[PDB]
Design a protein around this ligand. Structure first.
Ligand SMILES: [Zn+2]
Length: 19
């Protein structure tokens, strides 16, 4: 659904600002 590490779970992992 949301991210994989971001507990917030709202955006997409692909677009996640992990970098
Ligand atoms: Zn994220």
């Amino acid at each position: 659904k949301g991210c994989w590490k971001c507990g917030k779970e709202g955006h997409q992992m692909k677009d996640c600002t992990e970098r």
